[PDB]
Amino acid sequence: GHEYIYVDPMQLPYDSRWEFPRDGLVLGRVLGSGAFGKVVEGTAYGLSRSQPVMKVAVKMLKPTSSKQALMSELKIMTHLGPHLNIVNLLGACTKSGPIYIIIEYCFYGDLVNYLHKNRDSFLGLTLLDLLSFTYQVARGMEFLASKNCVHRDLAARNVLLAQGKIVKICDFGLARDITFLPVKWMAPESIFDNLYTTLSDVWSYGILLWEIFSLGGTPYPGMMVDSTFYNKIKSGYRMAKPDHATSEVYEIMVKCWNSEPEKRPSFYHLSEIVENLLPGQYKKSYEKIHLDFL
Ligand SMILES: c1cc2c3nc(ccc3c1)-n1cnc3ccc(cc31)OCCCNC1CCN2CC1
Numbered sequence: 001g002h003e004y005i006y007v008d009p010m011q012l013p014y015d016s017r018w019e020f021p022r023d024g025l026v027l028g029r030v031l032g033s034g035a036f037g038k039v040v041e042g043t044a045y046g047l048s049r050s051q052p053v054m055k056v057a058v059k060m061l062k063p064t065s066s067k068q069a070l071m072s073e074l075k076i077m078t079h080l081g082p083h084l085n086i087v088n089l090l091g092a093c094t095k096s097g098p099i100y101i102i103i104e105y106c107f108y109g110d111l112v113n114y115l116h117k118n119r120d121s122f123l124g125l126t127l128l129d130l131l132s133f134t135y136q137v138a139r140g141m142e143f144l145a146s147k148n149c150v151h152r153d154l155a156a157r158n159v160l161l162a163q164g165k166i167v168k169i170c171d172f173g174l175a176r177d178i179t180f181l182p183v184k185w186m187a188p189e190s191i192f193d194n195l196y197t198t199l200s201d202v203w204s205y206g207i208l209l210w211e212i213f214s215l216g217g218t219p220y221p222g223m224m225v226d227s228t229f230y231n232k233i234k235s236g237y238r239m240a241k242p243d244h245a246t247s248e249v250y251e252i253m254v255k256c257w258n259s260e261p262e263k264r265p266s267f268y269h270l271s272e273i274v275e276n277l278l279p280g281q282y283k284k285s286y287e288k289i290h291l292d293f294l
Pocket of ligand 1: 031032033034039057058059087103104105106107109110157158160170171172
């Protein structure tokens with residue numbers, strides 16, 4: 001079947017429709033950094049018609065092999081398409097200078113900080129909210145898997161909250177189409193055998209759920225990543241139920257942490273389960289928003 005081939009998004013051309021004048025972008029504070037580079041706050045003039053002056057986030061390499069990785073990140077983002085639970089690419093500065101990737105700025109920030117600041121409220125922040133976040137992330141991950149994308153860095157730091165409490169997944173760069181790494185979120189196959197699949201991301205989703213239902217807790221609390229950590233996880237060690245987690249959600253985590261990647265639940269499958277855990281009215285409202293967005 002030489003006539004049938006795989007279209008690598010890395011070999012596809014860059015549509016210049018995404019180019020933004022570097023003189024139209026004002027850069028500001030460092031919002032943060034992931035595995036590589038940094039994300040800074042910025043103001044863009046002329047990117048949106050509705051908003052002539054719009055606040056944005058900019059992914060860029062730090063002053064310190066990464067340039068093309070950034071370009072690849074741009075490429076995957078360009079071809080992923082739009083989704084409500086996936087942060088949006090607004091444009092890029094790729095000509096005559098360092099690569100700048102312009103992305104949507106989310107008001108409430110990352111879930112980790114949100115969950116932390118609204119911890120005491122958890123007695124604003126409500127259990128239903130947590131489940132909603134869980135559902136939306138599952139949907140966005142389903143979208144990425146549909147697009148044959150393995151994020152490789154699913155975590156609460158990379159799940160953002162936009163206005164309307166709509167979650168957005170961010171931080172590609174470690175993403176691949178079917179270096180320091182986020183071990184406590186990585187599956188055993190990925191760490192020991194360098195194998196990454198959608199199922200590996202499912203493991204990360206479980207770690208994410210523990211983060212959410214621990215209200216911002218650090219995975220494997222107190223444990224330092226070392227020889228013993230790996231031996232334990234290899235032997236089958238798994239984290240215990242988080243304090244604010246139901247048996248039903250912990251079960252989801254347990255499934256996600258099966259040693260057999262093929263036995264872990266799919267994001268499609270994961271979506272339905274969480275749906276049941278929430279009011280059936282939720283699905284409809286979600287769909288409405290998910291149609292308006294487009
Ligand atoms: C990679 C890593 C990121 C990204 N972030 C973005 C946009 C694209 C990103 C790409 N983005 C959007 N609106 C934000 C509001 C706050 C913010 C980042 C925001 O940083 C605050 C918390 C820092 N924690 C992580 C730092 C790196 N992050 C994800 C969050």
